[PDB]
Amino acid sequence: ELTPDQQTLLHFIMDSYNKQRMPQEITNKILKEEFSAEENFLILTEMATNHVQVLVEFTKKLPGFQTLDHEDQIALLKGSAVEAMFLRSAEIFNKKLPSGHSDLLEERIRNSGISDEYITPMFSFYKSIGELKMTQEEYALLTAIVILSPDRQYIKDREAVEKLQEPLLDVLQKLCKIHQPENPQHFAELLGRLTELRTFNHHHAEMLMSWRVNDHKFTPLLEEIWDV
């Protein structure tokens, strides 16, 4: 049994989460454009920039986020972005997409100048997330939880952030005992994946280092959320 407040919170979040769209201007490129590495990298750069917009729109609308210290709000976006991005792509790769999209998107990522060192962990993480057979509820809440991690670099008031995080952890723990009745592990299995998810903070840093020594260029929004 969820409380009446925890039912108000979860509606506030799945409303927030289901506005997350990738425009067709961009999805149509998966199938339409030529297959070359320059073109693949560019398709991903658009995809990234548009999603980073959508992520700041989601984060903005989290309960209590607006109340937070201004320098901390930034530390939260910058610390959480890589994780929130890889979690999203994991939802996308375990979801029914239009015909051919799953397959060709994969092929594009696989020929976009990303070393095999990092392609591998990427797709075995998507497999791993696939097996928890998650719901939109759980994607939304995990994403929300990841964003409001209080233990990122730079954060000045941890307690403030804890206070917004803990409510969401509560709702997710109670949802794991409801919709997965015969397994008390589901919730600690989820939190277990966040460890694997946290490795992409290194993989993605290398992905960029490598991209940059080959004179590739990113949008000014991506440059901001991903710098120093």
Partner: peptide, 12 residues
Amino acid sequence: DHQLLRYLLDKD
């Protein structure tokens, strides 16, 4: 100077 992030946060 993360102007774009500041901008996206304060908006509507």
